[PDB]
Amino acid sequence: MHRHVVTKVLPYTPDQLFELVGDVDAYPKFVPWITGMRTWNGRVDGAVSTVDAEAQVGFSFLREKFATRVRRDKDARSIDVSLLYGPFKRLNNGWRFMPEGDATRVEFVIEFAFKSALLDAMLAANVDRAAGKLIACFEARAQQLHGA
Numbered sequence: 001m002h003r004h005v006v007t008k009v010l011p012y013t014p015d016q017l018f019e020l021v022g023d024v025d026a027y028p029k030f031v032p033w034i035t036g037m038r039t040w041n042g043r044v045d046g047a048v049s050t051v052d053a054e055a056q057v058g059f060s061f062l063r064e065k066f067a068t069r070v071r072r073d074k075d076a077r078s079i080d081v082s083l084l085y086g087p088f089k090r091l092n093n094g095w096r097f098m099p100e101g102d103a104t105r106v107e108f109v110i111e112f113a114f115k116s117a118l119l120d121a122m123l124a125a126n127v128d129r130a131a132g133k134l135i136a137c138f139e140a141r142a143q144q145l146h147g148a
Contacts, residue, residue, distance in 0.1 A: 002120070035057060
């Protein structure tokens with residue numbers, strides 16, 4: 001389906017990312033862009049872990065839930081989420097982050113399949129805003145942590 005790319009850069013340590021990598025079950029504070037979350041049931045191998053990820057959507061205009069195979073890696077420092085059951089059509093999600101100068105660059109790929117073509121663009125449209133809040137959220141938290 002339509003994949004939205006969200007790239008951001010923050011002059012912070014890769015430590016803060018550690019929490020973002022596990023944001024699927026981390027959240028040192030909270031996340032309005034999201035609602036319900038749950039990660040478990042799977043397997044753990046080496047510096048890699050794969051389990052089901054049941055996330056929900058609050059102010060998404062569509063109160064629904066979705067499950068996907070969340071794959072975390074501490075050796076790869078990357079996150080990947082495949083579709084398992086979701087809406088029973090398709091739903092991909094992945095999070096990546098790498099160093100770039102004095103600051104680090106993080107990219108978030110959002111992939112989902114909707115029913116309504118109108119809501120498809122409508123949602124995929126506000127998707128940017130949602131990513132804007134999530135981003136600002138991380139940035140705020142970053143400043144709240146570093147607090148200068």
